Amino acid sequence: SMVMEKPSPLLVGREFVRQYYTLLNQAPDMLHRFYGKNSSYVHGGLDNGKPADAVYGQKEIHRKVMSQNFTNCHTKIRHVDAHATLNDGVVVQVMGLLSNNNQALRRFMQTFVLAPEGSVANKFYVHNDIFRYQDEV
Amino acid sequence: VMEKPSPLLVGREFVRQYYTLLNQAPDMLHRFYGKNSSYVHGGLDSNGKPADAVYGQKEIHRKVMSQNFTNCHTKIRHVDAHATLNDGVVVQVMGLLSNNNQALRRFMQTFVLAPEGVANKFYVHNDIFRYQDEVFG
Amino acid sequence: SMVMEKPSPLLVGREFVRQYYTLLNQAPDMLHRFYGKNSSYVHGPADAVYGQKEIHRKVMSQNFTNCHTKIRHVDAHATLNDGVVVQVMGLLSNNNQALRRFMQTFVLAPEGSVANKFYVHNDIFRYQDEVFG
Amino acid sequence: PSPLLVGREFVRQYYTLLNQAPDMLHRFYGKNSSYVHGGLDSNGKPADAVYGQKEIHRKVMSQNFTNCHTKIRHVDAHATLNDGVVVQVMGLLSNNNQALRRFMQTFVLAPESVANKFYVHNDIFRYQDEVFG
Amino acid sequence: PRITFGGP
Amino acid sequence: RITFGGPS
Amino acid sequence: RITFGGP
Amino acid sequence: APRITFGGPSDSTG
Numbered sequence A: 001s002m003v004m005e006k007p008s009p010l011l012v013g014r015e016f017v018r019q020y021y022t023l024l025n026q027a028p029d030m031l032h033r034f035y036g037k038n039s040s041y042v043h044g045g046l047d048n049g050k051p052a053d054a055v056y057g058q059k060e061i062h063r064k065v066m067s068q069n070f071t072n073c074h075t076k077i078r079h080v081d082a083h084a085t086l087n088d089g090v091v092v093q094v095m096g097l098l099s100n101n102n103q104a105l106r107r108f109m110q111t112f113v114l115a116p117e118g119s120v121a122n123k124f125y126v127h128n129d130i131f132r133y134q135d136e137v
Numbered sequence B: 001v002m003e004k005p006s007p008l009l010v011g012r013e014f015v016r017q018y019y020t021l022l023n024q025a026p027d028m029l030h031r032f033y034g035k036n037s038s039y040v041h042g043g044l045d046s047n048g049k050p051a052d053a054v055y056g057q058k059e060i061h062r063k064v065m066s067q068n069f070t071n072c073h074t075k076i077r078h079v080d081a082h083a084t085l086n087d088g089v090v091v092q093v094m095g096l097l098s099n100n101n102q103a104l105r106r107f108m109q110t111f112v113l114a115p116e117g118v119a120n121k122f123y124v125h126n127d128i129f130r131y132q133d134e135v136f137g
Numbered sequence C: 001s002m003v004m005e006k007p008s009p010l011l012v013g014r015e016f017v018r019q020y021y022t023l024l025n026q027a028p029d030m031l032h033r034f035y036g037k038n039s040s041y042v043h044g045p046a047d048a049v050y051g052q053k054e055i056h057r058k059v060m061s062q063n064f065t066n067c068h069t070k071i072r073h074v075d076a077h078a079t080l081n082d083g084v085v086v087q088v089m090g091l092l093s094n095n096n097q098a099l100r101r102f103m104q105t106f107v108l109a110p111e112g113s114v115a116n117k118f119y120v121h122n123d124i125f126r127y128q129d130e131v132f133g
Numbered sequence D: 001p002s003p004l005l006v007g008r009e010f011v012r013q014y015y016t017l018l019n020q021a022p023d024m025l026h027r028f029y030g031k032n033s034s035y036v037h038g039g040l041d042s043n044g045k046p047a048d049a050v051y052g053q054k055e056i057h058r059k060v061m062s063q064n065f066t067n068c069h070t071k072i073r074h075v076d077a078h079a080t081l082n083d084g085v086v087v088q089v090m091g092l093l094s095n096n097n098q099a100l101r102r103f104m105q106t107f108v109l110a111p112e113s114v115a116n117k118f119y120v121h122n123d124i125f126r127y128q129d130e131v132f133g
Numbered sequence E: 001p002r003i004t005f006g007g008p
Numbered sequence F: 001r002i003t004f005g006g007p008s
Numbered sequence G: 001r002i003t004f005g006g007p
Numbered sequence H: 001a002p003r004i005t006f007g008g009p010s011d012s013t014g
Helices: A009-026 A028-034 A057-067 B007-024 B026-032 B057-066 C009-026 C028-034 C052-061 D003-020 D022-028 D052-062 D128-132
Strands: A035-043 A074-085 A089-099 A106-116 A123-133 B033-041 B073-083 B089-098 B105-115 B121-131 C035-043 C068-078 C084-093 C100-110 C117-127 D029-037 D069-080 D084-094 D101-111 D117-127
Touching: A009 A028, A009 A074, A009 A089, A009 A106, A009 A123, A028 A035, A028 A057, A035 A057, A035 B073, A074 B033, A074 B121, A089 A123, A089 B105, A089 B121, A106 B089, A106 B105, A123 B073, A123 B089, B007 B026, B007 B073, B007 B089, B007 B105, B007 B121, B026 B033, B026 B057, B033 B057, C009 C028, C009 C068, C009 C084, C009 C100, C009 C117, C028 C035, C028 C052, C035 C052, C035 D069, C068 D029, C068 D117, C068 D128, C084 D101, C084 D117, C084 D128, C100 D084, C100 D101, C117 D069, C117 D084, D003 D022, D003 D069, D003 D084, D003 D101, D022 D029, D022 D052, D022 D117, D029 D052, D084 D117, D101 D128, D117 D128
Parallel strands: A035 A123, B033 B121, C035 C117, D029 D117
Antiparallel strands: A074 A089, A089 A106, A106 A123, B073 B089, B089 B105, B105 B121, C068 C084, C084 C100, C100 C117, D069 D084, D084 D101, D101 D117
16 A cells, blocks of 8 residues: 655646646647536637637537647647645646647746546646737737 | 626736735735735746745745835736636736836736635735746746 | 618617517527628627627527517617617516516628618627626 | 727726716717717607717716716627727716616727727617616 | 618 | 727 | 735 | 546536
């Protein structure tokens, strides 16, 4: 037998970043699996040039993910902060560069709130996902 | 004029008050935080790595005071805010900050605001602030 | 022959209201015909959507069934680009729910290729009861 | 800035000015601008809109706005025609320290010469009590 | 022509 | 910044 | 009135 | 203890 301390916020965060950006490249059509009924997703200010509202739950998020046409998504992660927050959650701030559809790497930040899934030990879901490119602003 | 609160209004009002206080009375900033609050404001350690977060009002008071905020000027270019776990508000901030009348430095920041437990009163559970130049530079 | 002035904003607005809320009751599946590629639609967690396709999807989502409307007042004013801005104040019952006070804001723009043809550039709906308290 | 940010900032500035100096509200409007602020005519019919700064100023001064208090419950704003912004507002307005009165309002804001400067092309305001009551 | 409605 | 006023 | 301050 | 994993809670409605 072997007992260790609960995974740290930083371990949960770093493992989350590894799986999230891998899936974005490899199977963006499977990213929706990370989210639950009450999850919010926000990816940039503008979509066809129109202001994009937050969407909620797996289906609307799957749709929003599919609409962004993630193809050949290359990510360079430069820094990850992950801290304990409300309700045994983890707040993550990612700083990195992202290329979609062979466009040039652009600086971004991404804010996530991760929450315990509730039924499986060390399992989390994404409650909040907020992406912004720096150039945007 | 009174406005019915929303997460976005809470977040923009918060960012205004925080950066006003950072300019006018940085020595009072620590009053936004509680015992389990996290705080980092960029910096590189003697090893060239990103500075560690500190926890709780006493450490945060020490850390803020150690930053020597003098005539701090901020240009906020992006604020977004969403409801999160336990009636919290997660806030994403991007902008420029000039300290001690030096050059403006781009930053990427995440707050988690939590109900203080006084109606529509919030404290800062988490303050993640990084300068782009120490991460991307 | 007979030529009349341009229809006034309020004549365009009243005729719009008649056709729109009739179609909401009779065939909500045909409401998408009122919109263009650049139109905006929100039936106020609701996200705004753009274009006939996404608007059709949102309208079909609302499952408009047995929709009864009492229009209490229409305002319709000339606006930008030979448009008409319309504010409706009314009561709406969907799916046999109790009549609830609403407003609806429309911007109607000329369709361009036909005289006296308009489409819905902007459609913003909100129930009162979910705003006041 | 987003349509919502433009719309929310406008609404705060408008209702602030209505309290501090309603005699200066006319400054937001142009020669083709429309304005109505509720009211019932001598036949009990909703009052008519007026057009242009002179008549808008006359109508505003007619309201005798005194110490007005405003509760903004809902603001929705979409991009519209010609880089304008259509704003839907629901809230409560108290005049001369009488009871708060529910209102339903639509603005169309349009680019003014100066960057991110807007004027009010249309101001449609109705009190619920005169329309549903 | 009477007042009519539809997308372009 | 965002400003408001009628055209000249 | 929305306000800010620690526990 | 199982390793760190990610996914939404059970929803048989969706």
